């Protein structure tokens with residue numbers, strides 16, 4: 062129902078757009094990217110190296126992008142305040158360039174005549190929501206919001222289930238992270254974090270991740286009880302989370318399997334998956350879950366100290382959660 | 395002897411700098427990069443993911459980069475005309491940003507007080523030299539020159555030897571090319587060539603290459619008798635050239651081995667290598683040859699139609715040829 066605009070036709074822009082048509086839960090009506098011409102948008106959307114060719118039709122027609130006959134207005138504005146979202150009928154705007162992630166910078170879209178803005182990335186100040194965890198806390202007073210880190214979306218559902226059933230005393234998260242577009246193939250220059258500037262093909266690269274601190278925001282009971290770090294490795298797609306955590310109430314590893322499977326079939330259906338199959342990363346390519354619990358891969362030392370493993374498709378799962386969130390926002394309109 | 399400045403501390407900047415100290419044939423006295431602070435230069439120079447830690451000492455000391463006690467003036471100028479090369483004593487300037495590759499744009503360095511400029515990349519108009527092939531054609535009248543494509547440096551020495559001994563009627567070159575910094579890990583945006591914008595980890599990517607046309611410039615007899623294309627593949631370093639070519643004078647494949655080995659031991663020593671060992675790409679990591687002929691890997695259909703294979707370290711070989719060229723220019727001063 063709700064008409065949506067997308068600022069930035071990157072991996073996220075394009076895959077959010079894919080999810081919109083794939084699910085039909087919202088309607089893309091407008092796209093802004095100053096660094097991509099319309100003809101190139103057709104190419105970049107149609108062919109995905111990782112998710113394969115688009116299941117549908119896409120063509121350029123009289124300066125509009127036409128996906129399954131649905132025509133889409135294109136803008137080429139460097140400055141977000143000058144996008145005429147209102148004119149094109151864009152109610153909600155997905156901010157997916159990841160350079161306007163503050164309340165202040167993201168707000169520019171409201172000038173164009175957007176009603177609401179969803180930042181497809183963590184925000185320093187804008188409120189963060191993770192579907193299945195704290196999305197019920199959205200109300201219509203919020204004009205600008207964030208859908209958090211892809212990693213945060215994987216970790217929070219699992220964390221919720223564990224904290225609800227046994228209570229997390231304290232936890233430490235490692236994510237093994239497939240490669241992002243903020244990384245380099247060889248070269249050198251990367252202003253602020255030096256490790257991220259190293260060649261991504263060749264090595265395992267440590268990296269920071271506020272994803273653990275951020276779960277503390279969406280599940281406020283867990284505030285300051287989690288932190289973590291990341292290793293970037295050269296797989297094209299699909300990442301994994303390793304939550305090492307202390308429980309207050311004892312839990313045989315079989316009990317943890319039960320409550321997680323239970324949640325996957327019930328309140329967190331389609332968000333938290335569960336599997337006992339002997340899976341590997343690429344088995345999750347184009348999986349729409351936020352988080353899939355690997356029962357086999359996890360290990361427990363005792364009934365109060367366990368390592369839980371959860372797979373997530375960094376691109377596809379999050380992309381679908383952005384759409385799912387907007388759909389929910391539109392229901393509460 | 396000659397004092398040298400380097401514009402741009404990229405893969406090429408840094409490895410040219412390495413070769414300067416490693417061989418001691420020139421002396422780096424100045425470095426300009428506006429996008430890298432001095433402390434980060436230390437990091438990026440010291441550690442190479444591919445060639446390993448620098449065999450020597452490097453530290454920042456009072457705003458200077460100090461490599462083996464040799465201190466180096468740092469500049470932070472976006473605009474090349476405003477670099478005070480003369481002040482820092484930089485006689486020759488290595489233009490290694492690859493965005494000032496025209497006579498016109500590269501000329502800016504002369505304003506700073508550089509005497510000569512060497513473009514570490516093909517140029518549209520500036521004269522190109524390949525060591526061992528046409529470097530004798532340099533004279534002091536030339537203020538701005540190019541050291542050609544890394545690929546051109548691999549192809550030309552081989553081509554010379556073959557054309558000198560048997561004559562190339564016509565040839566077609568394929569290069570399988572390790573990844574460059576003009577490629578992407580996943581993302582999307584790449585203005586002009588769409589294929590180069592695709593994910594470099596995941597796939598084999600066709601790409602254009604004027605390297606074959608360019609050999610026609612350095613060996614003028616071969617003008618318009620070669621062309622080719624490239625495939626980019628996800629290896630960190632080391633590329634290979636596949637020259638398919640028609641000979642006018644008959645040549646058993648054993649004759650070709652003989653004349654190439656001969657050249658490698660004699661007039662093209664240290665530029666053209668020869669090997670019969672059953673080698674692979676990574677066996678050429680940090681090899682300083684412009685081109686190493688794989689005797690085993692090549693194949694011949696008949697005495698007039700053969701496929702010749704030659705390995706080159708895209709970074710290290712070329713870096714060393716830049717230094718070797720400047721050294722020669724300085725001898726002719």
Ligand SMILES: NC(=O)c1ccc[n+]([C@@H]2O[C@H](COP(=O)([O-])OP(=O)(O)OC[C@H]3O[C@@H](n4cnc5c(N)ncnc54)[C@H](O)[C@@H]3O)[C@@H](O)[C@H]2O)c1
Pocket residue numbers: 068069070071072073074093094095096097138139140157158159160181182183209210211212241242375376379581582583
């Ligand atoms: N898998 C993931 O990468 C992942 C998962 C979760 C969250 N995120 C977050 O989502 C963000 C989006 O990154 P991406 O994956 O799309 O990479 P990307 O490089 O493909 O995306 C950037 C796109 O936006 C365009 N753009 C840049 N500046 C712009 C401007 N001022 N106006 C309009 N368009 C502009 C660029 O041309 C490019 O097409 C990141 O900040 C990241 O934190 C990413």
Ligand SMILES: NC(=O)c1ccc[n+]([C@@H]2O[C@H](COP(=O)([O-])OP(=O)(O)OC[C@H]3O[C@@H](n4cnc5c(N)ncnc54)[C@H](O)[C@@H]3O)[C@@H](O)[C@H]2O)c1
Pocket residue numbers: 248249250401402403404405406407426427428429430471472473490491492493514515516542543544545574575708709712
């Ligand atoms: N192996 C190879 O990549 C190879 C081989 C042969 C030739 N070449 C050629 O050499 C060139 C250099 O590329 P690279 O490999 O160093 O990649 P790179 O991205 O690491 O190099 C660019 C460097 O120059 C800096 N820079 C950019 N603009 C600048 C400016 N205006 N002033 C000063 N510094 C600036 C950047 O910060 C960066 O450090 C390319 O044009 C390429 O055609 C490359």
